[PDB]
């Protein structure tokens, strides 16, 4: 080979045939959460257990 | 290439094929709540049990 080379540089890859290193260190992480709720109570009550002689009609 | 490259600045992507390094860190959290109530009690009595000679008649 002829070709120029640097002397300080730090030797990265160039050409077709350049090696290179590769570190993977990946970490992906994703997270996803969703809630709902809806609570609906009723009761009503309404007795006499004694009415009025006045009021007995009703 | 032929294209002019500065060499103090910090190397930011500026053309159709420059790449760029993406730090997802999303991180979304809302919420929401909500709430009524209402409540009504009553209660009424009312009783001789005696009931005096002239008060028989009411
Ligand atoms: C937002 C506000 C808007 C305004 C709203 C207006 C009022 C909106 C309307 C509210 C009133 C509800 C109407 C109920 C009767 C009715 O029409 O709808 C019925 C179906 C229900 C539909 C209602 C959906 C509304 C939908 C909701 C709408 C809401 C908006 C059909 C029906 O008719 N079913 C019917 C049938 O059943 P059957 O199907 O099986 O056959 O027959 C059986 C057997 O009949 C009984 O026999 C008895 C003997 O056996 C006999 O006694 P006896 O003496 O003879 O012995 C006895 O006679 C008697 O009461 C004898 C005598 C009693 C006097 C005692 C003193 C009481 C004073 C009491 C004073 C009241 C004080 C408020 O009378 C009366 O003078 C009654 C008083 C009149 C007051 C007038 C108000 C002046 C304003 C005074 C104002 C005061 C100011 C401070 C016989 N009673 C009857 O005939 C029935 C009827 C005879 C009508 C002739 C009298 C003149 C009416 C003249 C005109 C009336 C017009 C309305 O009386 C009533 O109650 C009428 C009540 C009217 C109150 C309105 C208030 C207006 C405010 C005005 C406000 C604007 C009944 O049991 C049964 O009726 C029953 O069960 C009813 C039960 O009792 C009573 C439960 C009440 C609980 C509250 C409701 C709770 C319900 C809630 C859930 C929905
Ligand atoms: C906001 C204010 C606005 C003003 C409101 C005005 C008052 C608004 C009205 C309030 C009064 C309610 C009227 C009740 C009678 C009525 O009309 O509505 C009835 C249906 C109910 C509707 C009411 C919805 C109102 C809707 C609400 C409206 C509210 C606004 C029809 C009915 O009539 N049903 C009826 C029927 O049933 P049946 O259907 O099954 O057949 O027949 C059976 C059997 O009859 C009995 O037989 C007995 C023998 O067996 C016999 O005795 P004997 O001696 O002979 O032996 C006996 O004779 C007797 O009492 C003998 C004698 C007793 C004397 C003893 C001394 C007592 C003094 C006591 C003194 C009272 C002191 C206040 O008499 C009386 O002089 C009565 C006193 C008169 C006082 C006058 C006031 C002067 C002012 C004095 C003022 C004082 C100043 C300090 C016979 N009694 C009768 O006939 C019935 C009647 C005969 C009437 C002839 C007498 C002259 C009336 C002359 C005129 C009256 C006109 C009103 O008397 C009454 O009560 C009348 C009470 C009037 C009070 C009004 C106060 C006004 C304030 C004035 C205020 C402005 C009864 O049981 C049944 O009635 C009963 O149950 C009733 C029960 O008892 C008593 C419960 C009372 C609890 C409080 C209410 C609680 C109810 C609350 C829930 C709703």
């Given at each position: 080979?002829?070709?120029?080379?640097?002397?300080?540089?730090?030797?990265?890859?160039?050409?077709?045939?350049?090696?290179?290193?590769?570190?993977?260190?990946?970490?992906?992480?994703?997270?996803?959460?969703?809630?709902?709720?809806?609570?609906?109570?009723?009761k009503?009550?309404?007795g006499?257990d004694?009415?009025?002689?006045?009021?007995?009609?009703?």
């Amino acid at each position: 080979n002829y070709g120029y080379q640097p002397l300080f540089e730090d030797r990265r890859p160039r050409n077709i045939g350049d090696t290179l290193t590769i570190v993977l260190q990946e970490n992906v992480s994703a997270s996803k959460s969703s809630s709902a709720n809806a609570s609906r109570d009723g009761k009503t009550s309404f007795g006499f257990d004694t009415v009025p002689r006045y009021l007995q009609g009703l």
